[PDB]
Structure formats: structure tokens, C-alpha cells
């Protein structure tokens, strides 16, 4: 008889001993956020379908407009009609409602405030004094259980804790000056150093974003995307599940930072800013890094978004997990073969960055992310084909042989999506039991 | 199968709310939360304050005394603190307990000034005429979007203006948040022949073309509500209010980007229970709540008003009225004796009730009086209701994303056949 799937048992079987799994060498240095393909001058500008050179997202806009007018849901993908094409882009656009400029990357701006003091919720609750009263709990075991329970309330499908490895914190963030209003933000972006100093609280000066030396821990959350929608990549419905999950990320950060603050600690939100989420997720045990460059989780494969919160709250670090992803990616290469831009390498991992967009000095598969971004204006979306085709994105990968869990080696249209299965937040009740949590799952 | 149950209990079309000739639209300031006769309550020291400040004083007293609720010892002070920290954090995306001020803060009646609208402006989705006017296809699209936006239940009704507040509680537009509670005002909500929802110095104006209301149910966590009137019931209440706010904003933006207008509301604009009953989410009950088949009354409500053409859902009758006629459990367990044990009438018990509709008449000033005494939002009635079926064990026990329960989550799966 088939053994009932047990996601907790799977995670226990593949748990590692303590220690960051990322292999580094001496040339590793912290990475300036401006170097990402989204922001760097060498990659920021892309032609639209008329050959006009524009900021990449404006060229992508031109393609969305063209597709709606032509009744298409993606590149050379006809929709049922113009109304369906329109609906997919309306859903995508709406999904981003709680996200600033595609990722919330500006630290201590807008939703990503490093202090709760000015928030309407903090002001309303000020008479109770929860943000002023010293912590009543300092035991890391109890704090880990409390904060993980809160994380699940706040919309995380996965949550893990690691010691903060500063190698993955950006050396300088992309941000805007404090007096710049939103409508000028994309014109007034600047770099600002992120530094660690002996100070009591996270603070921003004119010159620096200062994280306290007491900022010991990072809490990493996984926000599950919708499988049916992502499997339409590179078309519009994959864009929509991406977009909605960015707003879920923002809610998570704000909810959890407020909880931590009301417990008597400080908390720094981040979403896509501050540091490299995949590295934190690997160190916090959510999953393993992969050929495509994403964190692959046992529950969702790479079809999951990441956000993280930094804190001085005492916590128990989770153990890394090794469920064989590295060895599978070594012989799989499906994402590399299916990538429409040939951005993903078919070669071995190296320590040497492929271009300015990669951080050298850590052993990883080196992908050309300027090629990736170049496909987004061409397709009018955020692609995602690599996530969509990855065997680990399939819901059907885990089997039990009578002794232990293992990966099934056999694993290696949009109208129907609109007319088909959906549930709250795009979660899937056929698999939602996999993320149930009791105290034993939160702290050991 | 929940889809089969709901089809089995579908009624013929027609509002199931019985009214008479005396029914008039209700001024929002009359609720116990806001009315001057109910607003001020003593704290445990005998100091008269705004009721929520007196309740704050009780939360502080409980933390210092290591309690999770009235006469309910916590495991230790740390556990007491954690429950209140979770409650306070849950409210992060909600203004002044319910987002009631229309066209303020998160509840904007136009998307034009939102950061997301400005970012997306070159696509022109909010300025392009609708490409779909077919109510069937629109109902399927908007219900799919509603589920993406966090609704566990969604229904559509024609807008019955009897349940829209005659006058809203709001603040002047240029008043900063810091002075909001001190400068609340009343403002009429009126329906006129105008293209778009609009606010003047004198009126909140809803277009006469605003045909429909979309009602969402946002499920609370059962284990946490079972701790009522203690702190963890407060926490699941609070988190769902922030879920409500995000739902309203997400769905309003979707509707706007489809070429229509959309008015969010959360706890403002009109009476959610009446809308939910007319939209088929559930039936009204003795306690006054909308009882749903999936969650009983343990579900929060929000709603969005729109001119988007839609197919109204049918009201449902699964026997709630006949059950509450004999049950009376909420009324016997209510710590304030707010809930009547008598029959339904058309006559309100006090200013806080809207007369003219056949309902169980409850004393809602008695209910609110228990909140400063208990330091929370009670909820004992929701907790004890048959349809709904210690704190250390809750913190150490089962949880899942947003507090949803995988044992039951299949019941809210949705395919096109059950959307339209
Ligand atoms: O960080 C991301 C992911 C997907 C789309 C966009 Br724009 C930004
Ligand atoms: O009306 C008031 C006075 C003081 C604090 C708060 Br919160 C509200
Ligand atoms: O509408 C509500 C519900 C619960 C608490 C408070 Br304050 C307001
Ligand atoms: O930098 C720009 C210019 C015009 C529109 C948008 Br969105 C961004
Ligand atoms: S598609 Fe294959 S090679 Fe690529 S990330 Fe997934 S398992 Fe690894
Ligand atoms: S998102 Fe698309 S273009 Fe980018 S790496 Fe993945 S498959 Fe290639
Ligand atoms: S919330 Fe509590 S006091 Fe209010 S009606 Fe329900 S049981 Fe009674
Ligand atoms: S407890 Fe009984 S009388 Fe009260 S609302 Fe529930 S079913 Fe009705």
C-alpha cells in the first residue's frame, strides 16, 4: 500500500549537520546591488519590438499592449479573444498592488521601514507599549516557536532560521533619497552602503544604512506560487502568480517585523532588497541551490518566492537540507535546454562569475542574467520557463520504497486555467497538508 | 463535497431579508464602536476613557499579571506578551480597527494615485474601455481574481441600497493620521447620475450605475477562535482584518484594470452581513452573524461595489433560521447577555440596531461593554456556535499558511462550474 506522504519525515531524512553548505574561496566579496541585471546600466536598456531602446520594463509594457491588441496571452500565443488577453494582464498588474517598483528593493522606504515607529499600526497601539517594553522572552527555543507560528499566520508556506552570513548582504543598496516622492523615484535612484556598526538599533544616516552588530539572525520565508499558472510560462498567467506573490511577500515582512518589534526586538524587512535571498534560503534549510540558480524546495521545487527579515531576536538556527538536488541538476539540464534565451549554463559549477551580474567566489552554476532579462521585453512578461519545466515543480515527485523517501527518477492553455481549479491565494488543497506545522516542526 | 451542498440549498432569486415600510438607511455613527452614548467606558481602575483605550489598559494589566485573558492565567508573562504582540501585529494593514473611513488611506475610491497604478500607467489598463462586457465571463474572471486575492468564499449580489450607510464616519481629507480619531466626522453617501465614484467637500457620491456588490468571506482560524474571549481569538480576528484590506485593494485594482470602477470598503460603507446573505454566502443567525456552511460564523466579511456586469448568486437556505430558533447556545454563553433568547422582530432594541428588518435584535452596547472588561474582542458566541465546528497548546499545536486548515481546505476548491 502507498505510504501517506509525510513532508516532515522527508525533511528529517535529508537534514544535514550544522554549517553553511555554500562553498566559497578567497576572492569572494560582498556584492553591490546595482550590479543586478535589473539595475545595471549595461543591462537596464532593451529594445522594444520596434527597435526603440528603452528601460527594459517599458519595452516589456509595449509588448503587453501589442499582445492585448492582437488577442495574445504571450509571444506567438493566441488568446481565446482580446478580452481574455486583457484579463490576464489586468490580473498581473493588480497582483503588484503592495509592491514598489518591482521588488520593494529600496531599504527603509515605503513599505520596507527599518523601524515601526511611524507606522499607523504602531501609533494606534502605542498606549500598550509593546514596542517599548523589554522582551519578556529571551529563550531562543520559545522565541523560535513563537516567531515561526507568527510567520505562518503572516502567509509563509515555509519558514526557516539561519545565522546571518554577511557575505550575502549587499555591499551597497539601490535606494532613493529620503525626500524624493514616489513619482520621481525611478529617476533619482542612488547607491547607499550597508554597514555593520556597534549601534543599538537599525538606523539610516545621510551616508549609510547601518545594521547593528547585534543583528544575529535571518528568518527566511517561502511564499508558494500557483503550479497551474506558472506552467503557462512565459505567458501572462505565470506573470500573475509571480505578481500576487510579491504582494504576499510584502505583507509577510510587515506583519512579521511588527510581531518581532512588539516582542521587544528589532526587525529589518527586505523582500527583494538588502541581500541575496537564495543564499539565505539555502543556509536556513528551505532547500538547495540548483542549476537555474533558484532555491529548490522539497514541497514546491523552485516554484516558490522568497523573502527574509533580519533580527536580533535570539533564535535556534535550522539545519541545512541535502535531498540530492546538486546531483540531479548535474545530469538533468532541462531548464538549460528549454531556456528561450540560453541564459542557463549546461556546464559545471565554478567559482568564476560569468559577468558583472554574478558574485564570484562561491561555487555555483554561473548563468548569464543579461540574456535572461533580454527575453522579458521580447515575451512581454517575467518568463519563468525554467521554473515551469523543472521536474521538482511537479507535484508528484516523492515516493517511499518501504524504508525511506526518494525522488522518482522517472520525472527526469490559459482558457483552461481561467476555467479550472483555484483556491485561496492560489494554494492547492491536494498538497496543502505538506506545510502543516506543529511545535516539533518549528523547533527541536 | 461543498459544491454539492451549496447547490442543494440554493434558493430562488430574491432577497431573503424581510422588511417593512419603516425601514430607513442607517447612519454609521450609530454603531456601538462610534456612538457617543457607547463610546466611553471605564477601565479597571475606574477611569472613563474611549473604550479601546480602557481595553488597552486591561491588556497591559494582563501581561504584567501573566494572563491571556480575564481570569485566565498564561503559562508565564512571556506567553501573555506573545499573544498580545501577535494580536497587535495582525492589525498592520488596517486603519483604526476596521478601515471604515471611505476614500481614505487604503480605501481609495479611485486607483489613480496608487503607486501600482502609476507604475503601470504606460499600459493604460485603467484607461482602456472594457474588452469584456459579458456578465458570465466577467463573473468567472472576477471570482478567480477574488480567490487569488485571499477570499475563501466569494459571492455576487445586486446592490441593495437599504444596507448602505446613510452617512459614513470619516475624517477631513487633509487631516493627518495622528489626528484622525479626534477629528472624525459624518458624511452623507448619496447615489447620483455621475460617471465615476467621487467625493466632494459635502458628499460621498456613488454612481447610479453601481449595480453590484462582490462579498468575500475570509476564514478565521478555528483553534485560535476557540480561545475566546482570550488573546489568541483577538489575534486571528486581527490578521483577517489585514487580509480583508489586501483583498479589497487587489480586487479593486483588478476591476479597474478590466475597465470598470470599484469601491472598496472593509467594515465601512454598508452592512456586510446583509450583503453576504443576499450574495448567498450564508444565512443570518441569532447572534447576528452570517453563518456559512463551510465555516459557520467563524469567517470575516468584506465587500467591493462595482458597475462591472455580473451574474448574481442565489441566496442559500440550509436551515439556519430553524436551528437558531431552538438552539439559543450563543445567548446562554454570552458573557454580557447581549444576545436575545426571544423571537425575531422588526423593532430594534436600541439606537445601535436598524429597525425595519426581521432579525434577532441584540443589545450591542452590552457586547461592547465586555471588551474593556476582558481586554479583547470576545467572540465567545462565534466560538460556541455548533456551525463553527488552552493557549499554550495552541502555540504548540497545528498551524498552516494564513491559519487555514488542510483538513478542510478542499471544501473551498473552485472550478468554473461553481463560479458561474
Ligand atoms: O523580481 C522580479 C520578478 C519578476 C518580475 C519582476 Br518586474 C521583478
Ligand atoms: O484617542 C487616543 C488618545 C491617545 C492614544 C490613542 Br491610540 C488614541
Ligand atoms: O470590527 C472590529 C472587530 C474586532 C475588534 C475591533 Br477593535 C473592531
Ligand atoms: O521612467 C518612467 C517613465 C515613464 C513611465 C514610467 Br512607469 C517610468
Ligand atoms: S530543470 Fe533540472 S537542471 Fe534545471 S534546476 Fe530543475 S532539476 Fe536542476
Ligand atoms: S526566466 Fe526564462 S529566460 Fe530567464 S533563465 Fe529562466 S527560462 Fe531562461
Ligand atoms: S462577542 Fe461576546 S459579548 Fe459580544 S455578543 Fe458575542 S458572546 Fe456576547
Ligand atoms: S449558537 Fe445556536 S442560536 Fe446562536 S447563532 Fe449559533 S446556531 Fe444560532
GROMACS .gro file of N, CA, C and O in nm, chain A residues 185 191 241 324 372:
model
   20
  185UNK      N    1   1.090   5.855  -0.823
  185UNK     CA    2   1.180   5.755  -0.767
  185UNK      C    3   1.268   5.692  -0.873
  185UNK      O    4   1.390   5.680  -0.855
  191UNK      N    5   2.303   5.478  -0.503
  191UNK     CA    6   2.360   5.370  -0.423
  191UNK      C    7   2.387   5.421  -0.281
  191UNK      O    8   2.424   5.536  -0.261
  241UNK      N    9   0.078   3.497  -1.115
  241UNK     CA   10   0.112   3.433  -0.987
  241UNK      C   11   0.241   3.490  -0.930
  241UNK      O   12   0.252   3.507  -0.808
  324UNK      N   13   1.963   1.578  -0.257
  324UNK     CA   14   2.019   1.529  -0.382
  324UNK      C   15   2.004   1.621  -0.501
  324UNK      O   16   2.030   1.578  -0.613
  372UNK      N   17   1.889   3.639  -1.983
  372UNK     CA   18   1.756   3.621  -1.924
  372UNK      C   19   1.671   3.747  -1.937
  372UNK      O   20   1.560   3.743  -1.991
   0.00000   0.00000   0.00000
